[PDB]
Design a protein around this ligand. Structure first.
Ligand SMILES: O=C(O)c1c(N2CCCCC2)nc2c(Cl)cc(Cl)cc2c1-c1ccccc1
Length: 135
C-alpha cells in the first residue's frame, strides 16, 4: 500500500549547495574537513521496509547509513563525527530531522519540490540549502 514517505523513496544525487560552509562552521567543523566535504557530490538511497526508513549515503568523503522509525529517537554518528540523538518525524509531507548533542540542536528538513529533493539545514542563525535530483 502507498504511504506519505513514498515521494522520498529513491536514489538522490547532490546537485547544488547554498551556505554549506557557513553551516559546517556553525557546527564546529574544521577547515580541512569543510573543504573536502564541500567538494563532494554524495548519492543517497532512501528506502522503506515496513515502518523502517533507511538513508544510505555514499561519497568520496564518507559513507553513512541510518535506519529509523518515524518519531523514535535514535543514536547517530554524523559525517563530521558528532554523536547525536536524532528524531525524524513527518510534518505533513516534510521529513523533519532534529539532532541534539552537548546541549545544541540542528534541524534538517527534507521536502519534495518539483522533481527535486530539497534539504534545509538550520543551526543557530545559519540556514543551508542542499538540492538533490534523481539518479
Ligand atoms: O550530505 C551529507 O550526507 C552530509 C550532511 N547531511 C546533512 C543533512 C542531511 C543529510 C546529511 N551533513 C554533513 C555535515 Cl553536517 C558535515 C560534513 Cl563534514 C559532511 C556532511 C555531509 C556529507 C558531505 C559530503 C560527503 C558525505 C557527507
Amino acid at each position: 500500500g502507498s504511504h506519505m514517505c513514498d515521494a522520498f523513496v529513491g536514489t538522490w544525487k547532490l546537485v547544488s549547495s547554498e551556505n554549506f560552509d557557513d553551516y559546517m562552521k556553525e557546527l564546529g567543523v574544521g577547515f580541512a574537513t569543510r573543504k573536502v566535504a564541500g567538494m563532494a557530490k554524495p548519492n543517497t538511497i532512501i528506502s522503506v521496509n515496513g515502518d523502517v526508513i533507511t538513508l544510505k549515503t555514499e561519497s568520496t568523503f564518507k559513507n553513512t547509513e541510518i535506519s529509523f522509525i518515524l518519531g523514535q529517537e535514535f543514536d547517530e554518528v554524523t559525517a563530521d563525527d558528532r554523536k547525536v540523538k536524532s528524531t525524524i518525524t513527518l510534518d505533513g509531507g516534510v521529513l523533519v530531522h532534529v539532532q541534539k548533542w552537548d546541549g545544541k540542536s540542528t534541524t534538517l528538513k527534507r521536502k519534495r519540490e518539483d522533481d527535486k529533493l530539497v534539504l534545509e539545514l538550520v543551526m543557530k542563525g545559519v540556514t543551508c540549502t542542499r538540492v538533490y535530483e534523481r539518479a
